[PDB]
Design a binder for these strands. Structure first.
Ligand SMILES: Nc1nc2c(ncn2[C@@H]2O[C@H](COP(=O)(O)OP(=O)(O)CP(=O)(O)O)[C@@H](O)[C@H]2O)c(=O)[nH]1
Ligand SMILES: *C(=O)[C@@H](N)CCCC[NH3+]
Ligand SMILES: [Mg+2]
Lengths: 85, 205, 392, 61, 82
RNA sequence: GGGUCGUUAGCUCAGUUGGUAGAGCAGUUGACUUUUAAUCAAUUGGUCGCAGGUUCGAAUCCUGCACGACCCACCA
RNA sequence: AAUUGAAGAGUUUGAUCAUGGCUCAGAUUGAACGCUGGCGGCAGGCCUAACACAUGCAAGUCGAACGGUAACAGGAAGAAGCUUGCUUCUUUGCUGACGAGUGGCGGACGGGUGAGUAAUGUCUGGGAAACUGCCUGAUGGAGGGGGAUAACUACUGGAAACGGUAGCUAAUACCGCAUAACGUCGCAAGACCAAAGAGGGGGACCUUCGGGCCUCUUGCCAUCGGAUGUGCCCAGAUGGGAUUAGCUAGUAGGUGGGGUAACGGCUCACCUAGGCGACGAUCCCUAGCUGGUCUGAGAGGAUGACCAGCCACACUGGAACUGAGACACGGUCCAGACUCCUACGGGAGGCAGCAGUGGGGAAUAUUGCACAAUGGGCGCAAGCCUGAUGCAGCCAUGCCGCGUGUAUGAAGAAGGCCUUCGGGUUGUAAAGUACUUUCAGCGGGGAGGAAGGGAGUAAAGUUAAUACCUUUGCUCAUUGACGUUACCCGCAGAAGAAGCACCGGCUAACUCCGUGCCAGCAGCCGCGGUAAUACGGAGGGUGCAAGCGUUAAUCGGAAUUACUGGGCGUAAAGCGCACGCAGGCGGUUUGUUAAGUCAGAUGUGAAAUCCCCGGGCUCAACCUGGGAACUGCAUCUGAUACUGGCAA
């Protein structure tokens, strides 16, 4: 119904707005690397790796991404470029 | 609860009186006892095996006035105990409160000792008990509430009570209406004619 | 229901009655809207009062209704009465509530068939005051005719026994009164004065045991079953259990809540034309026309002896007398219960228009208070007017 | 198809009645019994000796 | 929030309090991790009417188990061994 | 509240210019009989739903109610 | 000390003994009905419509998170009357306090119902590839800035619901930079990852007179653990049906990518062609599951109402967000049905939460009260919310108690009744007479459920401080929904209170008249055709009791599904016979192994409930303490006769 505690809803509305934008840009950093791997530009991807790391790990510590989730991308993708490296 | 009826007819149906109508007239004699319970009392009591077990219940129950629903639980209460059933059954049938007053001498009849307890005349261990169901534990003392002490109903019954058998598993003082319930009864001293053998077997089915 | 009713000026249980098609319902609407200029809170039009869909397409009153109107001086409980002949049981129920009636007789029509029936049924129903109003005066223009119609009023009231000596006769046009002809509207206001002046307050027996004659049963969704009628005696608030004594075997339940035109009441006194909700009682578990007194005070009698004034055809009733085995309908304040009539050992049968007493049985039990003037009628016309001389 | 219990009844081929379980082993085809005195099926007159059965109320006296 | 509280057992007008060690999220009379001792506010005068094994209670409070108001007073009744 | 229609020996049913109510199965009484059926003989049975009015006269037309089964409103 | 426990009868025949059904004697209930009725105690109370539901209420709180005040209690600069402080009354968030807003934590719980589902569930014992706010132990840091928006203003959309454009503005809101490690990635090297500040009191220093600053309470952030809860996996146990024999496609598995907190066809891509199934896969039907419950000597059969654990659902089908946790009863969005509003564009909505209505049915409750106690949420706390919980109501629905009286009384009454009309019985029953007075009735005293919270004041720690804060004592003030309490006392008077079924045998207790295969009884056999012990009523007796009986359901008796614990020549029942796959079983000797087996130990077998032994309610029912058990399973270490595998 119409409860005073609906404030959590409009709050989550305001929350999901930026939460959308946070994870959206987050995965594009990851999408940057997949564009690189398909080609092979490892150094630039590595420049982007220590570039996407501080932004993704930052997402982990905030509360949007679970620490193991963000670490998972640091896990496989390191081996991915390492398949080339 | 109570039968509240002619408690002399119960001893004509049974034939063997169980101290029902004491009052003043000691022996009944005003009922043409043993064979006339109604219009067709001249009928022969063929009484099948079911009857001999049923009248045994009529014998015991009509003594203390305990109704079936209540009386039936006593049997379950008897069997759950250790060993001999009917023996543990009579142990319950003696501890009853209104029964003790009848035994202490304050009540000439059961209905007297029943309403005597009901009319606030008990003080056991310094506690008044209106309920007649109170099973009195051994080593318990009692007296009569001062305002109902040595009253008209008690005197007639108490002086008349010195002509009885006077049981052994208890003893009263009757000088200031002071009573003491001693140890629990034993089959040897009591009734000695009721065959509890039957009732236990009737409650076996 | 909404916003507790402020029990202001004393309400007087009234209601308009009269012949079929004499414009009674629209007059009431006209009364309400005009009083809505003395006491603003009112706007109940013709559609507001002839609410029933059955009545809607045809334009007739078949159900006993109620509207709330009042003058700044005194409050009023109104009853719109069914003006037809085959719906007079609704009218007796409609007039049972009254203490002051408003006789609507067309100044153009005179003493009509139902008018004579509504006056005859206004007589045995128990109405003590008959304020006569000449509706439809716009249609007639000659005043000489009016002198006769006024004398005709004197005729039917004094016909038997009424206060038809100083009857206040106002001349207004209900249609003109409702639509906007201020001149006829003020004439209704003359009647407003007569409704307050000619009628003094009815003494209420509130110190005696509670009593409530049942008019009709509703079932308003949300609260349960509502039962309406008038408070014959005493007062009650939520909580007091009551014995539903009626034509069936008695039932007991506690009264809860009392309203009046969606206006909430804490407690209801004697005379109050209100509604009553009960504690766990169905719509089926309650009928039209029972009694609601306090628990264990009334025996539903069927046997009794009662004096009665049977009516001759020339008097307005029976054409010929009746033997032992005559069974008309008996109206004890609310409904019908046919009782086969047997006259005592001295009579085989007695002529109409006379006074005689006899012992009669009832096919349906009811309170039966020995001394209450009860109503009787058969086949359309009023056949009797009696009083319960004794109860058994 | 039930059975009418008692001497005389006032049923009208309608008027909703109550039913209890019971076959009158005298008629090969009846398995139900009617509840006398209940809601529509009135009890028998002049009844005594166990008026619970027959649904008859104790006399007014 | 695992704590030590009461349970409110008993009957009509004759309550009783099974002191327990139950979770905060669960229903009072319901689930409990484990329990210890009991408390009778209407024993008032008899053989036993207040029992609590403080040793295991120490293992609880000495683990992060909070105490309810009356149960803290139950400890206050004994303090340690009084 | 209202608006229409239904009700006949005990049961199943008849019965319209308005003119003394019929048909079976029942069943009642006999006889033979232990009691019946059967068989031979005889045979009552509604006070035409309940009341009233009209008619000269009413199962029949008109009124009112009771009891149902079918229809719309019932809404402090 | 912890189950000291097992009854039969009627009924086939002219009669018998079997085989064998049918029915009853007992216990039980979430019961309904008929008739009848005093109260109190503890319990239960929609089994159908998981159909629709009008109205009130069912989850909020923090100023000690931030800008602010919409009102009130104050001071304050002040102003009006007018007895110049007697008061009026504009401004001031300066304060107590506090709408709305923002932010935090909560709403993922408590409470309801049993639609689903025969396995993802559940009970049970293990397991590893995980996560866990609130509480807490230990390691440290807690640096310093930025850029907006709500509030509120100005115009204003729209009937309303409900917003928009353009600006003001702080935060414990958000965003980087610094700093990162015992943390992540990673062979390593290397690289990266955080935050919040508020309040009390206050001495010097200090006063742009804001405060910095010092201390205490406390919170924020990163880390490892405990704790607690969640997700996952496997084995086993867990209805009926074969008149269902085949079922399966991302279905079985690998490799590689991706995915989630985590393993995984979890999901994809390519290859392989497997996987389940006669110890029953599928499909269909039914269904919440267990602890326990009713019964039963037990084994088992039925069952799971309340209560307690778990699972699922929250108008219908579906989806996703925020958040530690939901893919959410009182959240969002979508489509739909179903009700409502409307200015006809467009909007509102979910009682399977507590009460209450309609509806359905054999059938089940007040639109009562308090947050006094307990429990939870939030807060430093006081307090604030709570139809959880605690009470009262309504109902004989069930189990426990007492009551409707006690004693005398032959005249052996009246009347009813049988009559041998001799007399007997009803019947000490009644009146009478002599006593008592429970429970209501009514008038008075009156427990205890109450712990703590508050100020005051006192003492020790902490601290620069005899401040504050924290731990501990005493006083006063008090705080009870129930509640005209539980209970004690007193008044008057047997005064207000016994029905209900049966009475042929089964099975307790019999006669009279009326009806004559008619009217009816009935669980079973069978009663009634003119003397009914079975019908009707009368009398009396009988059995149970404020209920008694009827009806339905379950077990029993029923060894009439037999494992305990049955039979197959004629009673139901040997396939017509045979070969024979799996199936089940196996001579004799020894060695070995130790699965079955047995032994002992461990862990677990939740609690409650049954049982034993205590205690407290005037007793009891009931509540509660301890004890025993949970007959199980799994692991460990042993014995190895026998059964089995292996060898000879
Ligand atoms: N000329 C004229 N016509 C009028 C007047 N009043 C009413 N009419 C019409 O008379 C008609 C009857 O109205 P109504 O009010 O139902 O009458 P009633 O007398 O209640 C009828 P019922 O007998 O059914 O209860 C309506 O058409 C009304 O508009 C009047 O004063 N004058
Ligand atoms: C309801 O409260 C009544 N007073 C309305 C009028 C009578 C019933 N129609
Ligand atoms: Mg009209």
């Amino acid at each position: 119904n119409i409860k005073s505690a609906k404030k959590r809803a409009i709050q989550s509305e305001k929350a999901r707005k930026h939460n959308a934008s946070r994870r959206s840009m987050m995965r594009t950093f990851i999408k940057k690397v997949y564009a690189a791997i398909e080609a092979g530009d490892k150094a630039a991807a590595q420049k982007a790796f220590n570039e996407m790391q501080p932004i993704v790990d930052r997402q982990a510590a905030k509360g949007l991404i679970h620490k193991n989730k963000a670490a998972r991308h640091k896990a496989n993708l390191t081996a991915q470029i390492n398949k080339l490296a | 609860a109570r039968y509240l009826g002619p408690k002399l007819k119960l001893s004509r149906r049974e034939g063997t009186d169980l101290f029902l109508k004491s009052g003043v007239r000691a022996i009944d004699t005003k009922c043409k006892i043993e064979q006339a319970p109604g219009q067709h009392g001249a009928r022969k009591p063929r009484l099948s095996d079911y009857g001999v077990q049923l009248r045994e219940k009529q014998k015991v129950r009509r003594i203390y006035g305990v109704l079936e629903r209540q009386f039936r639980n006593y049997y379950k209460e008897a069997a759950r105990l250790k060993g001999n059933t009917g023996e543990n059954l009579l142990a319950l049938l003696e501890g009853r409160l209104d029964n003790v007053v009848y035994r202490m001498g304050f009540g000439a009849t059961r209905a007297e000792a029943r309403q005597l307890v009901s009319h606030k005349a008990i003080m056991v261990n310094g506690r008044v008990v209106n309920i007649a169901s109170y099973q009195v534990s051994p080593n318990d003392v009692v007296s009569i509430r001062e305002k109902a002490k040595k009253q008209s109903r008690v005197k007639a019954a108490l002086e008349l009570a010195e002509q009885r058998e006077k049981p052994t598993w208890l003893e009263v003082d009757a000088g200031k209406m002071e009573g003491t319930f001693k140890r629990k009864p034993e089959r040897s001293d009591l009734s000695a004619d009721i065959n509890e053998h039957l009732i236990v077997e009737l409650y076996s089915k | 229901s909404k916003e507790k009713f402020e029990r202001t000026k004393p309400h007087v249980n009234v209601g308009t009655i009269g012949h079929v098609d004499h414009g009674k319902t629209t007059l009431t609407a006209a009364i309400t809207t005009v009083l809505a200029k003395t006491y603003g809170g009112a706007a109940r039009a013709f559609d507001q009062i002839d609410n029933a869909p059955e009545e809607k397409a045809r334009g007739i009153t078949i159900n006993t209704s109620h509207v709330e109107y009042d003058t700044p001086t005194r409050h009023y409980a109104h009853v719109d009465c069914p003006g037809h002949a085959d719906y007079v049981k609704n009218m007796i129920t409609g007039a049972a509530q009254m203490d002051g009636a408003i006789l609507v007789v067309a100044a153009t029509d005179g003493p009509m068939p139902q008018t004579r029936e509504h006056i005859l049924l206004g007589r045995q129903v128990g109405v003590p005051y008959i304020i006569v109003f000449l509706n439809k005066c716009d249609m007639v223009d000659d005043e000489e005719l009016l002198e006769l119609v006024e004398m005709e009023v004197r005729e039917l009231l004094s016909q038997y026994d009424f206060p038809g000596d100083d009857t206040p006769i106002v001349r207004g046009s209900a249609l003109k009164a409702l639509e906007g002809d201020a001149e006829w509207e003020a004439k209704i206001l003359e009647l407003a004065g007569f409704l307050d002046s000619y009628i003094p307050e009815p003494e209420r027996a509130i110190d005696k045991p509670f009593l409530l004659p049942i008019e009709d049963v509703f079932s308003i969704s949300g609260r349960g079953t509502v039962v309406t009628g008038r408070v014959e005696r005493g007062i009650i608030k939520v909580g007091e259990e009551v014995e539903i004594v009626g034509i069936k075997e008695t039932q007991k339940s506690t009264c809860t809540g009392v309203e009046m035109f969606r206006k909430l009441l804490d407690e209801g006194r004697a005379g109050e034309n209100v509604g009553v909700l009960l504690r766990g009682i169905k719509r089926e578990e309650i009928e039209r026309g029972q009694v609601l007194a306090k628990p264990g005070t009334i025996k539903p009698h069927t046997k009794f002896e009662s004096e009665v004034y049977i009516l001759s055809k020339d008097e307005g009733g029976r054409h010929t007398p009746f033997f032992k085995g005559y069974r008309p309908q008996f109206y004890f304040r609310t409904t019908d219960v046919t009782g086969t009539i047997e006259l005592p050992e001295g009579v085989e049968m007695v002529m109409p228009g006379d006074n005689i007493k006899m012992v009669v049985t009832l096919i349906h039990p009811i309170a039966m208070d020995d001394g209450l003037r009860f109503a009787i009628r058969e086949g359309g016309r009023t056949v009797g007017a009696g009083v319960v001389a004794k109860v058994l | 198809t039930s059975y009418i219990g008692g001497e005389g009844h006032n049923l009208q081929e309608h008027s909703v009645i109550l039913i209890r379980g019971g076959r009158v082993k005298d008629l090969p085809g009846v398995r139900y019994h009617t509840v006398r005195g209940a809601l529509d099926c009135s009890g028998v007159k002049d009844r005594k000796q166990a008026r619970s059965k027959y649904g008859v109320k104790r006399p007014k006296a | 929030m695992v704590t030590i509280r009461l349970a409110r057992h008993g009957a009509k007008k004759r309550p009783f309090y099974q002191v327990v060690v139950a979770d905060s999220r669960n229903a009072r009379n319901g689930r409990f991790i484990e329990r210890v001792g009991f408390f009778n506010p209407i024993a008032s005068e008899k053989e036993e009417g207040t029992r609590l094994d403080l040793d295991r209670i120490a293992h609880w409070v000495g683990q992060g188990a909070t105490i309810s108001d009356r149960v803290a007073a139950l400890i206050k009744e004994v303090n340690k061994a009084a």
